[PDB]
Design a protein around this ligand. Sequence first.
Ligand SMILES: [Mg+2]
Lengths: 130, 53, 46, 349, 124, 136, 69
Amino acid sequence: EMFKVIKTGKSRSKSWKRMITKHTFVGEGFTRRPVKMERIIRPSALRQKKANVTHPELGVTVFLPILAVKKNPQSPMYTQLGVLTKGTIIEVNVSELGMVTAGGKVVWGKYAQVTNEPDRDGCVNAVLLV
Amino acid sequence: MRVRKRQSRRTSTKLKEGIKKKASAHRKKEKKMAKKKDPGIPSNFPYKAKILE
Amino acid sequence: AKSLRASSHLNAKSVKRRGVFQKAVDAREQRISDKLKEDLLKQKLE
Amino acid sequence: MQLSWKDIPTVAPANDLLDIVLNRTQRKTPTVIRPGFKITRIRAFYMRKVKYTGEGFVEKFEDILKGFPNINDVHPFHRDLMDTLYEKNHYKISLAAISRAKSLVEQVARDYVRLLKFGQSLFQCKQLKRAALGRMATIVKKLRDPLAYLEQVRQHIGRLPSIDPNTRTLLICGYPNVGKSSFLRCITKSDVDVQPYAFTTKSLYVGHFDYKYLRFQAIDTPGILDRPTEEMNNIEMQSIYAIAHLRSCVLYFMDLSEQCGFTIEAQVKLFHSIKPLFANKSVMVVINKTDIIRPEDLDEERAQLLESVKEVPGVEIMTSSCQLEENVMEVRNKACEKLLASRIENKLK
Amino acid sequence: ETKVWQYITLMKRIFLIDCPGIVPPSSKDSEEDILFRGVVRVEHVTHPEQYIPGVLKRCQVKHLERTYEISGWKDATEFIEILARKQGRLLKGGEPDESGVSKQILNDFNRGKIPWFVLPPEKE
Amino acid sequence: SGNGAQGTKFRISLGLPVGAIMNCADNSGARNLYIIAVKGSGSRLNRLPAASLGDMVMATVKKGKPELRKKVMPAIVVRQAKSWRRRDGVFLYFEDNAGVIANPKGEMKGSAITGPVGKECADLWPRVASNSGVVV
Amino acid sequence: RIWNELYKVIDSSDVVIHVLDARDPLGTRCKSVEEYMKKETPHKHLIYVLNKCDLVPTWVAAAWVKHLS
RNA sequence: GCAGUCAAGCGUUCAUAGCGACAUUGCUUUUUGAUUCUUCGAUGUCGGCUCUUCCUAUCAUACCGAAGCAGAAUUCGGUAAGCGUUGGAUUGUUCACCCACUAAUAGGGAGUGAGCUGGGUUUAGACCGUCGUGAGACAGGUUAGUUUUACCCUACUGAUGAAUGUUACCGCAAUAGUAAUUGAACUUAGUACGAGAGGAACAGUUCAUUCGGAUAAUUGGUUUUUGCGGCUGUCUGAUCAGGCAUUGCCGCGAAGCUACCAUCCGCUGGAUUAUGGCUGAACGCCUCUAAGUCAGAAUCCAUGCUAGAACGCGGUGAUU
RNA sequence: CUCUUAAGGUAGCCAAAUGGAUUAACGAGAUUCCCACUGUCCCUAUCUACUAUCUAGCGAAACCACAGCCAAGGGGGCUUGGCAGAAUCAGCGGGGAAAGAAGACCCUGUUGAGCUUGACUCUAGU
RNA sequence: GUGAACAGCCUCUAGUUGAUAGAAUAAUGUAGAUAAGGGAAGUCGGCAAAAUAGAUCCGUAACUUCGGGAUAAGGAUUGGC
RNA sequence: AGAACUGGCGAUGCGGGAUGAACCGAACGUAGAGUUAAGGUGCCGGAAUACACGCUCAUCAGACACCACAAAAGGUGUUAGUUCAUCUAGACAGCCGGACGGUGGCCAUGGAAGUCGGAAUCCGCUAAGGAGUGUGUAACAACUCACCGGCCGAAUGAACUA
RNA sequence: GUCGAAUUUGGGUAUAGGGGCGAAAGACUAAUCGAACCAUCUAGUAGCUGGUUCCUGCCGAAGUUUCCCUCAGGAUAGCAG
Ligand SMILES: [Mg+2]
């Protein structure tokens, strides 16, 4: 799984292609690769620019933009591909939560681990790493 | 008035073997998951006092 | 639309039948029996 | 539309609404599917199911968005009346929440119809369809209170009297128990309670009657009190708005009898406090229950208070009583005469 | 004509691309304005003749006179009639084919055969 | 069967399939009517709806005044051109198909109808009989 | 269909360019799409182009480029 | 979906060891119908012409309860598949929506991939753009391109046939099927309902849509009656009278056939689903239910009709 | 190491008639639309010549494990039921390792070659 | 002979009566036709039929390489003595 | 899903589960008598429409793999049990009366008196009586219930398990 | 479609197999052409599909372990006599 065998051309023999079947954080500066060099595919409908991170403290939950995929287990080449898959850690813009580290340097980012499987629903829930 | 079709009662040998395999699987699962006051004298007995002594 | 088998229209027709709807058939059968007796007498006369 | 919007789609509580929607989706759309079916078939099945549920929610919301009066830009009279009745701001906030839930259900159905195409397994499409139906239910779950408020205002707004402000009208006014309800009962066929207790009519009443080969609609109003334009209920404010927004010879009934135990000086004070409203209305005062008082015997000091009513040129102190209806015909004749005299002058200009 | 996009190369460092023409829908799309923009094929319009009057709203009369070169029209009905007569286009016995001449008029308006342009906004 | 018609209409042969052109029969200024639907038409698979004399029908103004164009309006047929069996016992047919546009209530639009009008249409629409200067 | 093709060519293009008819560039604008390119993809340049200058007087195209500059 | 709260219960201390039904809090794009001029990679084909049959998760028709149902109109819910569930535009594509009628244009299975059809399993031709030094395919698109029933067997629709001693006539019916459906003009009535705006229902009448069975009384169509009359080329010497021009053509054209393109017809008794009651305990009250029982749906069974067991049957005439 | 933006009112400066490729004619090439037109359709009906039908004479072909009534269960035959009366004639195209055909489409060959190159070994010619 | 013509048809000299046939004219087929009213609403698609067809005269547009378009288009007539 | 071992098939007949790769029985030369397993004893089908004790009316129960996913409960459809309470100084139900007075308690006011709106909810006398469980008026009124008293009388009520 | 021309065609002759010819389709080359036919090597190559013929009695297992880059191809312990 995780790699659909796309087929192309009048004769679908080689097909020269694969496509991810799961959500991915493509990044702000994607700028789609030209199709002739395009082997892997991350269709935009599966992409998400935000995740429903929840802070264990105070019980609050807030929708915040995703920032980067830090550590994906199970062949972190998927982390290079940005896949979440129910457990991948992801950086998030925690500035909305009001977190402020000691010394007056206000925080604006914190790690978070996705919990819900992206494939089974369009929301990307995650528990904040306090 | 217009009687509707009734479900067949036939054993459905295929379904029988499948239910047997599902039962063995459920038994294995219940066994794997297993690792995780006296009533007293019944009322209305004629001789409740005799047992006390 | 009401069905041809509908009980309400059939009961209404049964109620309507009691009057002229039956009297006309009665007078028609009486005239037919009279014409039959006349045809019988016309044959018996000869 | 206007004039008694009885065509409202009979909005239902959000729980029953979500139940009817889920039932219609389960019943109309195909249900059976099997793991061995081609994945494209299961995908089209779940897509048709989600699209049917979303279209049903969109229709259920659009029917309410379209059938409601749209208080704004209807008429100042109906606008002020519905504001006094249903708390216009809350009436707008409820329909705004309805439109917000409709747009949310639309965005959810679209995002899930887009995400559903990529499902590689029957369980994934099933979880996606369940997620869409649950998002639609949660959007409906927050709409319960606004939907109940809309169901209440529909039950109230659908029984409001028909009226066209441009059409000829004659308002009636006076202290409670004065017999103004009896005057409306006598001047027209409209039925109204005439019980002795003060506020026999808690809301506006209307009653058509022909005259001079022309239609007319008497409009009783639910009483008024001498208060400093702030200590008043919606009923009294709804009555004052009916006078302010309706021209053509509002009637100010009065009763000198000991019944309706407010001193006649208080009636003159109320007539003075309401005087500015009648700057163009061509006031026609109408004493009531004359048979039991016959103000010809009235004390000269109390009669002087009537002279203060005469300071405005347009007043006419007609006499009338329920026990002698023949004078009521003369009052209606004078009212229609002043009405035609004003309208014909307005038309020639 | 551009049924689908196709990749193209030049200098090996850049790839040209093209897509079918986009028409952002809006309530102000003023269908006849969609026709004057050329977005629609004139052949399929049910009533080509009814769009004729609007072509005069843009093109100057002197250009339409110099080009055709039929002139002297008013209300554009005499325009279509005299044009169908001078061009030899007519339905049998004997009415002019105002619709077919209107099709050629709209085609010339879309292809630029008749000059026309909106006035640029005045300089500050 | 249609609202606004006085009395029930007896069956007569159809002769105006949807999309049929018919000459205008009134002074409204339309030159011809192009039928697009027939009110009361019997639904059936593969069966094109068709009209008959005196039937109401929606129709666009294929030719005439531009203001009447680009909109469909109800119209009552005043001529069929197809043979039909009158109950009196003689076949007849109009020289050409004709009709008149009208409001859904059936009130006539033009001040008068030009040309002969069929008896079946005038009997069904009293306003058409009032606007018809020649009955048959 | 053409909308999906437009989104595909936009995502795949490092630098979108928007041609405009010289006869009426203001009417040729694809408004609501340029806002999407500005928001979702700020990096995209979306440079304007003004073709068919031959069909309009050169001063008209000059004023058009001066206004769109 | 994610994070969280009470606990009706469970469980060796005991819910605070752990779980936990029914509920509930915070997010998924704005509380003044403001916006929502977003439509974002289905790698795989689905969709359509004639037509039979089946299901309810029922759009309509039929019978009911509730809903601020005064009326009309409308919403939900219970039964109900007996009959209906339409004519088309869009391919700079169509896993779609629009107008218009109709009471309604509800959802599904066998589909019919050798009944036919476009998109397509599209090999041999070619061109445009990409890759690759090249051979060639490919991130594409366009164009044109032979898979051809049965007389075999069986199923179905029609049609013969020895065997009830012979033949002929009149009959009964177990069996299988079944059909009629929907709409609207008078009266009720401008009445109840309404202050008005308009606006019922039942009985009594009358027309219409779809479908089914029939006939040419009248109209249209059809001509090998080559029936009559005419026309062209050619031939029998001319006239008359005749042959060929694949029924040479034309005008009419009977008989037959045939067209809602003409006309007639398509019914009257019981048992029932939901529902509303009776009496009446269970339970010293109550209760449409436990017994019995009344009314009631287009439902079921019957009336009627279609064919009649070729091995179901009766009566009657002759019987060398 | 500095440094990039002026064009004006319906046709212009112009280059030694025109500023054209948006090219005329031509095409069993493909595509969009209009008049006439008509049974493609509403809605199908009729006529003629020859087959198809019986008969006089002659007389095959494909296929054939055997022959062919169905419902359910069996991870056309087997099991339980409905049924079942010789021999047959004409339509028929629902089904039969029934013909006809089934291929296209997927996979492995150590096997055949049409082709290409700074793949390996050779080589006419130079 | 008819006919612009060795275009189509009949006839002259000359050569043939050879293609298995008899009996009716079922369904369904191959070939040739007709049809009241609409005239493409059928079909992916005007697939096939139909419509103008010869001749005399009026008249014939855009474009153009000036040669062509062109029988453009659209109109009046055709018999016999 | 990944490893070890014990077994049937493969190579396997025979009886039963209507038949079946696995189920139960079972040591395959040709026959007779006799005794058995699984499985049955109303017919097809050889054998009791046997005995003794309990539950089942299902508008398609049941003979079903059912000690397995729907399975958590819901049924005023039945039967047997466990626990907690009242009682001849009167158990449930049944019929009648009381259900009192500061009082129309304190806050909103055209009006809320228990019952259109908010925070308390006592004393006084009783056998008891709630600033009030519901019906209904503009309010009241009135009806009614929680509990007591008046009349027959004896077992009655609630939560769970099977 | 063309039918006065790069027109059609009779007879003769020349081009004959990794060759001939080709207004170029891998098209033609005697019903065969991305390489024709005839006789011999030749009964080629078998990774593989198919088959493998009379009777009776006794015994009678197998799908498990190592060794090549490695499927493949096989060698090896083991099982029975
Ligand atoms: Mg009063």
